[PDB]
């Protein structure tokens, strides 16, 4: 994610700032930082702002600029062509960009949001069923990082501290049992109810960094100010309320609504069990730990060897230490390439099949097949252009194109109306 931070200026910019002290008459330039610090911690010519903004944000701004193509654009400094193309398909997968590269109605909004397009998608959909106080809390935690300390890092594994760590890790996930971002949501929210005087003790009990939460607490107020700005027409009138920051526990329906919030911003970083997509291709059983159980993203390229595609879950994730068979579709913030034997996945939450198609209907990843003919599978044709029927959707890559590797979603009822010779998805019935 991109953030605005206080940082040391360049040498030349500092030298210019010295100049105007002397421009009127010979002047004395004073620097709070020392000369020896000046040589080391300052860069000699401030690095271009085009490099500072995310490449995806360059495209989204450019798509706010309705530019026909990023390569037709004339530019002083190059980002590589392919990444500029990866950004376009990236934004398209999020629903921000159309198949014709034109910036969608929501596509325009994420451009307005100063935040990253992936995180900006969270901002748009965050305000659903009073779940706004969370998606800021998750987003604040995601950007700042993980306040948690791993068991291996501490060195507790002494055995009594291991139990308290286990109890501490258990009480995180009483909110969500299969999800690792929502357990964290319970913690960042829990310390809010916690008194300030007793905070350090809970923060020792749960092995939480003193300084990282205060930024999160300071970060959530800023991000709520931004969402309350953008969402309402009164983008300056809205003021940050600590009671708005205050949140009430979710319902099980809200959790499911929250799960699809997690998938909206990271729709590309979603993986199914490798055994589910290829049953019996790779030997898997309950004895094999969740480290051993493989996964494969829909967007990932198919490889000559299946194990190359295979990705695996982290041990620190609760879903590993539950001891139960994990859900079919799992979703991660980032792929951690560490570990030649197995590639480590940090997964946020478990997304179900049809709700995954819900993030797919906003996005362009979904591919819908033709209506089927069978017992009780007839199609309603109210008018010549609209029809109701069941269609099997294929997420990401289709069956015909074998370059990628994707998974097929179960058929579910849908309304289809013809536009331009193809029937768009009006709403899943």
């Amino acid at each position: 994610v991109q953030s605005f931070e206080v940082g040391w200026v360049s040498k030349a910019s500092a030298n210019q700032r010295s100049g105007r002290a002397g421009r009127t008459g010979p002047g004395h330039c004073y620097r709070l930082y020392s000369s020896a610090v000046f040589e080391h911690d300052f860069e000699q010519f401030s690095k271009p702002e085009i490099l500072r903004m995310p490449v995806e944000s360059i495209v989204l701004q450019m798509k706010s600029m309705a530019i026909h193509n990023i390569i037709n654009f004339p530019f002083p400094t190059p980002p590589d062509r392919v990444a500029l193309s990866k950004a376009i398909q990236l934004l398209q997968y999020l629903g921000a960009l159309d198949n014709k590269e034109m910036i969608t109605e929501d596509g325009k909004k994420m451009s307005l949001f100063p935040l990253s397009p992936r995180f900006s998608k969270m901002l748009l959909v965050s305000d659903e069923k009073a779940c706004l106080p969370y998606i800021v809390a998750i987003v604040s935690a995601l950007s700042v990082g993980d306040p948690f300390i791993n068991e291996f890092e501490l060195g507790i594994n002494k055995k009594e501290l291991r139990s308290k760590f286990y109890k501490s890790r258990s009480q995180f996930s009483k909110l969500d049992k299969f999800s690792d971002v929502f357990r964290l949501l319970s913690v960042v929210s829990a310390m809010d109810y916690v008194p300030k005087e007793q905070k350090e003790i809970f923060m020792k009990k749960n092995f939480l960094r003193g300084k990282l939460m205060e930024e999160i607490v300071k970060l959530r107020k800023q991000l709520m100010y931004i969402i309350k700005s953008n969402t309402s027409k009164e983008n300056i009138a809205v003021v940050i309320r600590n009671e708005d920051l205050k949140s009430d526990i979710p319902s099980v329906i809200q959790i499911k609504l929250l799960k699809q919030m997690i998938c909206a911003g990271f729709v590309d970083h979603v993986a199914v069990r490798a055994d589910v997509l290829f049953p019996d291709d790779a030997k898997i059983t309950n004895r094999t730990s969740i480290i051993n159980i493989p996964y494969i993203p829909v967007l990932a390229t198919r490889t000559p060897n299946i194990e190359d595609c295979f990705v695996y879950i982290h041990p620190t994730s609760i879903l590993n230490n539950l001891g139960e068979m994990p859900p079919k579709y799992m979703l991660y913030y980032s792929l951690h390439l560490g570990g030649n034997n197995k590639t480590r996945m940090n997964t946020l939450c478990d997304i179900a099949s049809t709700p995954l198609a819900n993030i797919a209907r906003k996005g362009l990843l979904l591919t819908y097949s033709k209506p089927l003919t069978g017992q009780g599978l007839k199609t309603v044709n109210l008018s010549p252009t609209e029809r109701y029927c069941y269609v099997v959707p294929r997420f990401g890559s289709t069956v015909d194109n074998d370059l990628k590797i994707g998974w097929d979603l179960n058929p579910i009822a849908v309304h289809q109306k013809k536009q331009k010779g193809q029937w768009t998805v009006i709403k899943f019935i």
Binding site: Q171, L175, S186, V187, A190, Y193, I249
Partner: peptide
């Protein structure tokens, strides 16, 4: 608290 409820989260705790």
């Amino acid at each position: 608290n409820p989260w705790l």
